[PDB]
Every structure is written in structure tokens, then in C-alpha cells.
Amino acid sequence: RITLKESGPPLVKPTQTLTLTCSFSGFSLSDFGVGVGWIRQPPGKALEWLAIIYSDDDKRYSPSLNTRLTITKDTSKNQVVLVMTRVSPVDTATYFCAHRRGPTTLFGVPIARGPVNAMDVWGQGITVTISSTSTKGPSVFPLAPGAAAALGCLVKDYFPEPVTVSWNSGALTSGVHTFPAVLQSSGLYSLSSVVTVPSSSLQTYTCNVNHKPSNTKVDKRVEPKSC
Amino acid sequence: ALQLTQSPSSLSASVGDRITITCRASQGVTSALAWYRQKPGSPPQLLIYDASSLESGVPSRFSGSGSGTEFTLTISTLRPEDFATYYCQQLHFYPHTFGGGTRVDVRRTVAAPSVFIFPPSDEQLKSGTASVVCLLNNFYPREAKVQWKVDNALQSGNSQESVTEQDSKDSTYSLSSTLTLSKADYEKHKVYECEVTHQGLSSPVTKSFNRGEC
Amino acid sequence: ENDKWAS
Numbered sequence A: 001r002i003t004l005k006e007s008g009p010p011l012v013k014p015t016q017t018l019t020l021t022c023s024f025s026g027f028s029l030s031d032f033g034v035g036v037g038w039i040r041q042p043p044g045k046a047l048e049w050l051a052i053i054y055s056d057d058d059k060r061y062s063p064s065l066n067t068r069l070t071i072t073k074d075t076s077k078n079q080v081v082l083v084m085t086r087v088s089p090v091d092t093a094t095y096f097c098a099h100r101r102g103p104t105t106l107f108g109v110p111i112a113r114g115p116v117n118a119m120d121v122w123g124q125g126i127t128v129t130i131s132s133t134s135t136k137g138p139s140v141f142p143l144a145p146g147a148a149a150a151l152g153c154l155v156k157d158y159f160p161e162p163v164t165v166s167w168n169s170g171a172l173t174s175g176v177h178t179f180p181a182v183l184q185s186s187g188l189y190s191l192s193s194v195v196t197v198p199s200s201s202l203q204t205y206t207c208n209v210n211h212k213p214s215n216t217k218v219d220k221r222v223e224p225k226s227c
Numbered sequence B: 001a002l003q004l005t006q007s008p009s010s011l012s013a014s015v016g017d018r019i020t021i022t023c024r025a026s027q028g029v030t031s032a033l034a035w036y037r038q039k040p041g042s043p044p045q046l047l048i049y050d051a052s053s054l055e056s057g058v059p060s061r062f063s064g065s066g067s068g069t070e071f072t073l074t075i076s077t078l079r080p081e082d083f084a085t086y087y088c089q090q091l092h093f094y095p096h097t098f099g100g101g102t103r104v105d106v107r108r109t110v111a112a113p114s115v116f117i118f119p120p121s122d123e124q125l126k127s128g129t130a131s132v133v134c135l136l137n138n139f140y141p142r143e144a145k146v147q148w149k150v151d152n153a154l155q156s157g158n159s160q161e162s163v164t165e166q167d168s169k170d171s172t173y174s175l176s177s178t179l180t181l182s183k184a185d186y187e188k189h190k191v192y193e194c195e196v197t198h199q200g201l202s203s204p205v206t207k208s209f210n211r212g213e214c
Numbered sequence C: 001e002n003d004k005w006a007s
Helices: B122-126 B183-187
Strands: A003-007 A018-025 A035-041 A048-054 A059-061 A069-074 A079-084 A093-100 A110-112 A126-130 A139-143 A148-158 A164-167 A176-178 A189-198 A205-211 A216-222 B004-007 B010-013 B019-025 B033-038 B045-049 B062-067 B070-075 B084-090 B102-106 B114-118 B129-139 B144-150 B159-163 B173-182 B191-198 B205-210
Touching (some): A003 A093, A018 A035, A018 A126, A035 A079, A059 A069, A139 B122, A148 A205, A148 A216, A148 B114, A189 A205, A189 B129, A189 B173, B019 B084, B114 B191, B129 B191
Antiparallel strands (some): A018 A079, A048 A059, A069 A079, A093 A126, A139 A148, A148 A189, B004 B019, B019 B070, B033 B045, B062 B070, B084 B102, B114 B129, B129 B173, B144 B191
């Protein structure tokens, strides 16, 4: 059984250097033709290939990132390290390392190369956020209005993830939509949480927001304005 | 470099259906192509290697064929765990490219979004910023287009949006879009509009308000 | 260029 696992800092600041380690078990980087590669996935985006290293020590890099990447192996520790320099916000992504089989051998003779055509086992992935922001609590603002009515709370400018939002201390669940946060160009996150109700219920509505990182709890009652 | 284009980018289906996803390469990649299935929150999982070989431990309903520039993955009888995003990967040329992915989600009848526009709170305005949010609630299919207009000027580069994951009961999606402006710019205009295009809407729907109107 | 295992 082959397993891989990524480790490194979850948070990194722009211009800094990011070092990611892939520790694995079940194979050796001294085994014939084996490879270990790195692939990343920005939130909501497609997979992007970064680099790979083989047991005979040949290395290859994405041409778009070549100047900022270094991949290396430590055979005796069963680890592969990928160093990315000068990171910027667009480098925020989940980073995965993965195993690549070498050709099948028969009495130590390569006879099948078909198994090298895939990365067959992947690590769970490690989430890395690139932002110069310091820990900071959200500002919470009201969002106020088939014949459904909508209202919500805009949880703005906080760092880092995550934040939790519930409605009426947990009693309101139907019609609730809490969207995934977006990382603003400022380096702070922002999210909305809304709830749809029969245009008659306008019943009281309060969003309970909690950002553990900054010890910031806020309850904000939201109503249909006009005094 | 080499381009790998997946089709369709998104696909709706129901348990028991037969689906086929295709991947086309800009130059021939021989048989060096792999297919993966990735479920939300998890790493991609290898299904098919070398264009058509079934990876060990992978269920037989998955099948891959093709070589050169055109490949296909077919799942013969879709199971609930197959609602996910699929990717193809080429390993003939460096860099070892991935396709754009194809999202497979639960099919349900077309439903237009209920649209709502929210002006910025007076509380936010006092801090100097103005957020205008637009909500597209419970729609299907997933693709929707939101266009912000301020006093009829098309907005660009000053909004961000996020979409919920498919609802497990509804099978619909919801989308939130935030237009952000300084309090000053905000004050220099009157009509804030959120224009929405979607398959379930005969023509675009616009929700708006005039700033300061009381 | 060609992958490690290509012709």
C-alpha cells in the first residue's frame, strides 16, 4: 500500500519562499523508474501540473513556473521537496504530490511501459494561502430586501479562514445559503450568508457569526429596513 | 504548449445513466493519457491509465478508449459517487497537462433563479466602502451570467462571485455576486443594476435600485 | 520535449 502526505505552512506572505514536503511510504525513490510529481489546484479551478522527479534523479518543471521551482529528493528519508520562490496571491491553491509508477519489469527487465501513463496514488493535498494579511475579525453588515423574500449578512474583511455562520442560533436552516468566501485583492476574505422565507414571515432573523481565529462573535438581527 | 480540451465542460445526469466524457489533444499523445475522478474535498483518483487500462480496484462500469488526439471515458451505469468532476491528463509531452475538467451533477428540471439586489448598508458606508450584492437563488443548470451596470455603464474588474455546491434536496445552485466601490464613487451614481442571464429565463432579468431614493 | 518513457 502506497500512501503520500504533503506538509508545509498553511499561510505564506507574498515574495516569500514556500517549501512543501511530500513524505511517502510503500515505495522507495530508489525503485526502478519511479516518479513523484506535484500538482496544484487553486480554489474552484482545474488541476495544474508543476513538476516531477524520478529515482534516477531526472527533474522536469512546468515551463510557466520553471524559474520559481526547485524539486529535490531525499531518498533515505522517503521525501520529495518542492521549493517555490517569490510567491504571490495567485499561488494560493491546494498542493498535491503523487506517485508515478515506473515500467513493469520481469526478472529485472523492463517489459511494459503502459503503467507509467498516469499518476496512480495521490496525497490528500495541503491547502496554502498566500496573503500579507494579519489575523483580523469580520465586519458584519445587513443584507435587507415564488413570492419569497431574501435577506442576509455580509461577513466582510476577515482573515484567515474559516468563519461560521448560523441563523437564529441554529434554529433557522431551511432556505439558508452560506456561500464560500472569496479572497479579495486586499488579502482579506469576504462572504455572504442569505436566507429565503415566505414573503409573509417578515418572525425575526438574526445571523450568528463567529471567526475563531480573532475571537470575534457577532449576532446581527436583520430586518426589512424603513424604521 | 500542448492543449487538452475536455467536453462537455459540465454535464447533468441521473443515477443509472450512461455518460461519456471526451478529451481532445492539440497534437498526438499516443496512448499516454489518464482519467481521474475527483470528489469534492478529496484528491483526484486514478480510474484509467494508458488510455484504456482499468486501474486496479476501480469498478468495471468505468471504461476508457481512444489514442492519438481523441479519447473518451464512459461510465456505463452512473452511481451516486460518480457525481463529481473528471479530468484527463496527457503524459507524452512535458509539461504533463491536465484538461479543464468536466463537472457531472444531478439532473433536474430547469429552474430560473429568483434574483434579489441589496444596496450597501448605511453602516458600511460610514466606513467608506460600498458593497452591492446580487443574489441568484435556487437555479438550474449551474451556468449563469451576472452583469453589473451603474448608471448604464457596464462594470468590470470590481465584482466577485461564489456559487454554492448543488443542493442535496433541490439539486439547484445559488450564486452571490458582490460589486465593491469606494463610498465616494458610490455616491457619484444613481442606478445600480444586476443583470442576469440564465437558461430558464426567456430573456435577461434586471433587478435594480436608485441610490439614496427614500 | 518527450516524456521520460516516450520514443
